[model samples]
Target: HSHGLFKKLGIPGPTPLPFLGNILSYHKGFCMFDMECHKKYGKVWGFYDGQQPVLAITDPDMIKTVLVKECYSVFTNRRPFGPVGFMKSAISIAEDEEWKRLRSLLSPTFTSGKLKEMVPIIAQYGDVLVRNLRREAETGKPVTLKDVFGAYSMDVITSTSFGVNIDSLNNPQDPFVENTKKFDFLDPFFLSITVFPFLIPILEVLNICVFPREVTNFLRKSVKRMKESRLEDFLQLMIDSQNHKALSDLELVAQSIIFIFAGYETTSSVLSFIMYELATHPDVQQKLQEEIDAVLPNKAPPTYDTVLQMEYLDMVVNETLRLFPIAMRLERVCKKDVEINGMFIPKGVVVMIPSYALHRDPKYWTEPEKFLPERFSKKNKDNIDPYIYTPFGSGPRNCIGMRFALMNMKLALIRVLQNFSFKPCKETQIPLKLSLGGLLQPEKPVVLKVESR
Candidate 1:
């Protein structure tokens, strides 16, 4: 059985068992498990999900090869999460020419001059966020950062991705907001399939989908209806670009939904974490404010190009991501049987790159546990291995939305810090208990005090 394959390979790992495998060991959390496994097992290890074998590699040189140098050989596809429906066309799961075809069309929209067209919309929401928070600050209450930032995230994505804007920050009870969280959070459905691989066939046979049906249905309708109501945004861009590659209705809907979830979930969690760090460490918070104030003189929002020059802003966000990268693990599916750097990986085996483990490994980073922004300071950044510090991952198949994410993040950060400062309060979760179902976040609310700067 593949569960026993690790022994033949002679790799170190915790014992895996029948059906469930080592999945139970991660019940506490992924970040803790990654740390514990890496501590006990060193750079290379193995784990199983049901009968599936995953070779976990944290060695930077090996990572460089897997994520970059030798990718096309056996690692083009990501390990599938199953439940294929509209999801089959999602760029994250699509493989071969379809991946290339979809990627070619979608890539331009994210990086094109037209991309700058979306920022005013992002800036508009950033201002809405500050105004919304002004009432929160006036109340002198300890705020939960996740809830606060998530609304801003929702507003930005809904407006930019679909050309529909809802003030979810102020109106938290919206139907769109209510339905999306079922797909997020630690939903039992997502957890079950992740732990028990055999359940995938059952779900696929039952015609169940990975994402919530209501959300997908609504988005499909949104995509179809917006076809005629042409607007200057991502969905409109995707519709226009589909001539380059014939994207089916499934692919079109899948792409729009994927962008919404990725942009909304990630930006909120990351922005929350950054504020938490800034609150706990006042010196860094003050320094960031100084930079934001200087660059955005008189509290003017940063232009798309202007955000690039804020070097310390870049370092602070870089360090924050190193500590709290949203993708707990990045997986690549093996396309053909191959030996890489003396490790034998069979066809169909999934290679797991535990980004969290690699980021904090002492062998790679100096004072790895400390929140040191200088590590990413321009002068010192090159001294670190490019492969070791993958906030947005590394190489060809890395995150497609990095520039958009940063643009939105920096602009929002600039707007907020220009007006208010996050302060560590009695409700703050210092040394946050990081755990969630599919993503990483504190099991508890990241509570902090907010005030006018």
Candidate 2:
């Protein structure tokens, strides 16, 4: 029953099973499997996920063509993770004209000026984080950095998206936080779709929702509440768009849910990893602290300008993102038959850009496995290929909230490093094992000891 996809396409890959394809092979994690395939097949390879042929490209030149040059029409839409109806309204999943319209409407909210205004709001939560960390440090207890950062990210996104600030750090049982946790992307039902995509139609017919009932209901109610309130947050800006008449209430709710989901998880993951890297690499931490001390000598909350001026801080964050990118893979489906490297790729074939593999590729980096922030320092950055170092992604369809995310992260780092010094305790995992999921997260809680400075 096997179609011999790679043989037919004149491409190379590990032999896939009949009907099931490579599903069983990726039990460890998709990224781990991709690395194996890359080692075996070289730069470009063919893979089959439930009989659907996917062209996995690791070559920087090919990546540029797929994500940048031909992005507008040839590779515009993301392959749906599940049934399309579940999150069709979200800009990340929407296709064609719908994606463009939504992106245009939401783009202005992340402008430089808008993000500058959010500095104080983000810092207000940073203060709460410091206080929380101080209490734990006073007891000489190791703190799970991810949990604290997750709570901070959740509060910031909730406040910006819904105009209400709820501190999940102190109030762990908050309904909003609880509801968000229920929307797991890697649930068995969802993961099963990769092995048997035909199940999507059956599941869709059954009216099975991608999001949990509680999360959908909560977001729906939040959208309704926002409709009545006059607060001018990101959601308010979207609703007030002159083209607001084009979006339905359901569409608005979907976008709001996506905003909350995307904003928190990835940002928190980055923050946790950066902290771990700093704790392990004392010299880098000391240098970063010195840079912070020079800019924010009085231990004041970092303003937008001062944070931007912290050159070493930017290099550290960029290096962290390179080593542990939030999204392990980037996907795009070809709109039509396309030829690259003299091979014809047919329409509907998914193109998987393995960020994890690319980031770790020794050809593009020196000592790729080592934790080196200097690789991204201003003097060394220019020599690196832009296409190969995509932490936020490349092309126009890259992360919209990139500026906002960086500003929030830089501000948090400045505040925390200025207030406390972190050191690895027994609980800190030396070589962190990543969670087996779509995003990169530590298999265990990232714990570190902190001392008030």
Candidate 3:
């Protein structure tokens, strides 16, 4: 009966093999797996994540109905990671009303006023990043982008979000730097739990966390200490918001942890991919640098507005995210039985919108494999369907840090381009081979030759 769940529901999907379901095919990486399955199963199909039945949809109309029209009332929450300790309070996983309240209070943190104030903080670290990379460029050795960008991301996030600067770039021995390595999304023990769902209770009993417990404690303690300073940072905005809309102490600490966790690697990974693309696509790189020069003119520090207006930089960022979307997939656990595009989707099933499939599908894009950013240009933008291009996510529950991530990236790119240029080194992969079918992670270090321009 379990094996026939897709067929029994009158849905289209591949057959699941016993306990493992269809997950074995995900060995190449989640993005690759989704692209392959989309080719075979069409836009909408049922699949299994372990024994958990999920309906994956790439159709724009269906995605609109589910993600936009009925999101608040129906598909209100994301899939739960079993036994996540502190992360349980993360806004991404909080149920409907709780999420609404959380979203309201947290909105202040990302307000134009707060965001502008933090711009200088980001540039402060950008300076450090430039110095760090300049030293690497002088070495005449291939620079491993993620290692440096990851440190820069850590430095920026801690300063802007927590009112503290651990400076991971200069101090590699910091607890934050060491424990960050423990965040293996594909840890063998964690993968086994995905294959065998029943083992979740054991994780609960042992207080096992998806992220390292030590890092969580360190972050939690840092936030607690920052409370004494009353400094006006990302966390302080939330603390101050308690006068009108409040959060529990655990929720406050948990949300801070999520900020550091989400902002750190995802931003750096996108930077790695962007640098790799620039190294490979010299034309785009030079065009973007031209745009940067036009804006900054004298190699001055990029302001938020200055970077915001760089048209070519926007195109490159958009195209990079289109091809190498970091979130991999967005899921909403269904709250009730529903029909979209004539398919009946029952409650309790996870409904996923695979951004990787939508971004590359021939139906939605032309020459999907090519790294062309013109599709998002001002003239060609009208042909795009809003739901079809989801790098952050689709609908109301999309990434809260979307604007911050974009601004941070634009500023950093501007800073780096002023002093350095990138080109393909021997270790660089032309097409960029990736694995770990969950997030958009490079399987190996992305090494690029840095040139002092």
Q: What TM-score goes with each of the models?
A: 0.94, 0.95, 0.95
**For model 3, where is the 10-residue window of minimal lDDT?**
178-187
**For model 2, the run of ten residues with the poorest summed lDDT:** 181-190
395-417, model 2: which lDDT tens digit per residue? 97998889988998888899899
lDDT of 2 at 167: 72
lDDT of 3 by residue, 262-295 (tens): 7888898999898988888888899888888888
Q: Of models 1 and 2, which has the larger lDDT?
A: 2
Better of 1 and 2 by TM-score: 2
Ordered from best to worst TM-score, the candidate numbers read 2, 3, 1
Best by TM-score: 2
Pairs in steric clash, model 3: 29-437, 30-437
Candidate 2 positional error at 24, Å: 1.8
Q: Number of the top candidate by lDDT? A: 2
Stretches of model 3 off by over 4 angstroms after superposition = 176-187
Candidate 1: pairs in clash: none
> Would you list the clashing residue pairs of candidate 2?
none
